[PDB]
Symmetry: D2
Subunit: 335 residues, 4 copies
């Protein structure tokens, strides 16, 4: 069994915990501790009830210094400095680092002082991390000696599984992405100070362009495409679920039928359970609580010369939460 | 002075009337009559007050068989058959056909039997129309012999002013558009029967892919690009304002600086007052009630090899409304 | 077993069918036929997928002249005239009349000429109906001779279970209700002609006062309160779930503790399964897909002298849907 | 001239500045300084453009240590501790305290150490404040010796002008209020930690009950009604504009016509420019940017016995912003 602790019990941390229990604990992982500065009773209530993901089907109680989930006792801690946390005493294998304040190997190193063996950052990492992984695409690069890695971003986890089979079988010369994306808690209800002058504007009333590193990051996970992809995001008024719209130049002449056929074979083979393929006339809400990293909408595929457009749906919370569990097992199983 | 009547006083007709009066009657036009089947007191109320476009800054009174706007008496009629309308007796030069029921020349010709000289359809027309016009791009195609024309669509009026200068000064091999678009009254509040199984789903809770012919229609306006463009729409939860996202393959090597430079020059020259150019960090609500057909957002332009992305904002109601007035003048001035 | 047909397969009809199957067919009822003018493949699609109520957990197939739900074959018809429908040949006991076009006994009686035994209208009925029922409150008024009845409205089914115990155990002199209510498809996305000048305005951007007869209608269900209640609705930007806010004058001195105690006792006794009682800090989305007619929010109760405020949550679609099944059984069991 | 400084240039502070300039500087006030910790260029941009209130009609520049509005140079400061601000050197008469961190006379006293003469808190104050004022209702209580006062809340400023003429002419025994209220930046986009377990829930998807002190606070401004009013708020998915729904027991028998007549005479007399009276079929958006404290919607008035319901619209940002200017003049003019 792999012993995990969660640092930061915000949305990402809660959704990782719910994905573990709702899926019947199918990974050989036990969550043994959570560190968060909030009231444990408040954090238990937000585990039981959610707007986007509905009611948790199991049981949650607070009992002394523990939160008890489906009978499992999870130790609740509250310290700002990971060097002071009892990770060694609790025999923690992997800390899932979910606060956003420890995104370099230098900073995530504090968990190592606390006594944990390894760390997975739930976000893009600095240049000093040991690896950046999209599960299903490059988790094979991991080594038993890696100690701090990044699980990339929600958007990179949708785009990379799309790009890999297309580059392998057809060839991608250049590509430009737009992600039409749900709002997040980094945004605002009504206009107020923000570091990003566009995100300072009401998220509920507008389409809001914003930067994304996801297209450039595909170069970290597929080095053969470094520098060949770029793009941006448009934040729109929905609570959850997003879509990648990828336009690319193919290395040879092709058709809608060939492009869709490549993606379909990949969803049934090397990328089964990560990349899905759909032909039904669905809308974004139908993908809420869908655990896939990427689902191709086959009806939207277009080809004009060597210019191709493909589109893929993703639950930007739930896909990524499930992959954090997969990457945990891969990291601890690496030779 | 050109005497104008409006057939159909829904959102399109009311917005044309409001654009005429709010802009200070800048066009040498008088609106002399409106035909509509609804209660004139309800239609006056919806002229005074709107959610998207706010309160009309002038005055509106009902007085017998007239609606009086800023002192001008406008005759109100109610007849389903255009051949029976008194266009001849009221000396109507141009009918703006806004009902959606008369979109071919064979059907719209009924207005001419009623006594009008010319008809402009506020939508894409049938294969039998005399012309399809995007004002600023191809209004010079118009002839004094033309009697029934189309003003194209809101999306075609955003896209064609972008592609004209880019094709002229650089060259377009192939292109694919996504328009991220505000919902309209063809959609639904909560799921219910619809001819389109995606538009049958709540407009307020999802991103909803749907077809549009606007990219292909650029071929009617710019014959040199016929067959080289295609695209689709994604409907999202906003009440008004949309964005065109165009990905295209250039005919030679280029840069972000050159692409933006071509667009800025066109905005200051031949397309002044139709294509605008913006470098500020704005969001969709800032373009509400902006009368431009197309505003390039210069900060969003990307280039990867010969693959280029350009993005342009449009008020999908107000830009089109103002162009209907411009096209009226062009039709009556044509040699 | 009671054989049931549904006339009108809009949101009301689909939600009745879904309540029957999702609850495990708890009522001794079989749905044998549906009459509707729309394409059966579209109606099957909208059964499988909904925005407000999510994905149907079972299976739906179209197969000739049948829609097959969890293996049960349901005959699909399409005829505007109920007298021409084969209710006699299919041995239909009760027709649930859900089109909105047959709300008097004189009109709904056409189903009986078609061969059905009984009709229940899914809305307030005309002055000629045999009864108006809020299940749990007055279903004991029903007689074996009754043939066409009304199930009242969604709002009346929330209000009447509150006022019955309060009048019985304390006494109500006078009362005034505001229901703060989710939008419906009678409203609009952006302003356009409507018979009601307030509902002509965008539902997504405003609070919109509108009339309702639901408070006065309590007099049909509880004759002792006839003339003592009135009220109105405020429509707000949510897709589903509403709240009744009732202010009333008690017939004697009282306290918050006594008022809440009366309601809690009723929820555990005579109104069990119809009126619920909640003390948790929840919000409207938590009551989506809750089948209760009325849930008292105990934390909100206020008393100032003899003036009392009580507030109650209701899923305006799902509570009513489940009550239609309860009322079907009561009608066929009446002595 | 009264010399004013603004402490906190959030929404309340910006809207006070805009109300001064947009109204043509009709009060004899000059804004001489702003203290805020943000980038002055960002704060200037948010003065030029707003989602709810649209574009500022004037000019705004940043020039060294000043923000220049319509030609007026306003000194920009940035210090957390008001004791260290140069209010004395700048000869400040009144600080408009808009941060939410100085809501007691004890804390607001730091501005007095800085050298300012007086302070008005833009919010409910602690028990130690010299006065709590609703302009038009009780500004007559102010004395030349008062140094720290409260302008009450947005909701108290709507409710008090409603209650005063009704209590004066008819008599109010007891009253209970519900305010159906726009969301604010204290709330969240998607569920996240909050001190209030209901405000921790997405503001865009739900009706959210929450506490309000506004009804009890009417007792501070009209001591004859202390203890006779109570109520709560329901936050709903709109960006701005709210409504007070007041239910009360009148001291004698009355009618709809009498109640409306009392309110109409008050809007034309003692409360002119503070309480307005409307008979048109309007919705919340039509009241955006309306400077009144309270506008009675006469069509909504109901009477059942001695039980009365009256409803009043308020722009919860703009009404209050304009009253802050009125209260400033009253405070400095007091004998
Ligand atoms: K934020
Ligand atoms: K529709
Ligand atoms: K409608
Ligand atoms: K907040």
């Amino acid at each position: 069994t792999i012993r995990v602790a969660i640092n930061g019990y915000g949305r990402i941390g809660r959704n990782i915990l719910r994905a573990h229990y709702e899926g019947g604990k199918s990974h050989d992982i036990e969550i043994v501790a959570i560190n968060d500065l909030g009231d444990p009773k408040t954090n238990a209530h937000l585990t039981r009830y959610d707007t986007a993901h509905g009611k948790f089907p199991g049981t949650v109680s607070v009992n002394g210094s523990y939160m008890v989930v489906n009978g499992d006792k999870i130790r609740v801690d509250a310290n700002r400095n990971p060097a002071q946390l009892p990770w060694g005493a609790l025999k923690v294998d992997v800390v899932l680092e979910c606060t956003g304040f420890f995104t370099t190997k230098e900073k995530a190193g504090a968990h190592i002082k606390g006594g944990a063996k390894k760390v997975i950052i739930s976000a893009p990492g600095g240049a000093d991390v040991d690896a950046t992984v999209v599960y299903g695409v490059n988790h094979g690069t991991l080594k038993s000696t890696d100690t701090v890695i990044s699980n990339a971003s929600c958007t990179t986890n949708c785009l990379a599984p799309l790009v890999k089979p297309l580059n392998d079988k057809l060839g991608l010369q250049d590509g430009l992405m737009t992600t039409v994306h749900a709002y997040t808690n980094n945004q605002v209800l009504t206009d107020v100070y923000h570091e990003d002058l566009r995100r300072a504007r009401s998220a509920t009333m507008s389409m809001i362009p914003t930067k994304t590193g996801a297209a450039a990051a595909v170069g970290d996970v597929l080095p053969e495409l470094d520098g060949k992809l770029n793009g941006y995001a448009i934040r729109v008024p929905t609570i959850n679920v997003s879509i990648v719209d990828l336009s690319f130049v193919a290395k040879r002449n092709t058709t809608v039928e060939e492009v869709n056929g490549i993606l379909k074979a990949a969803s049934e083979g090397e990328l089964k359970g990560i990349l899905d393929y759909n032909t039904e006339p669905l809308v974004s809400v139908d993908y809420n609580h869908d655990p896939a990293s990427s689902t191709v909408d086959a009806s939207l595929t277009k080809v004009s010369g060597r210019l191709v457009k493909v589109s893929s749906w993703y639950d930007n919370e739930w896909g990524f939460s499930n992959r954090m569990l997969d990457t945990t097992v891969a990291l601890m199983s690496a030779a």
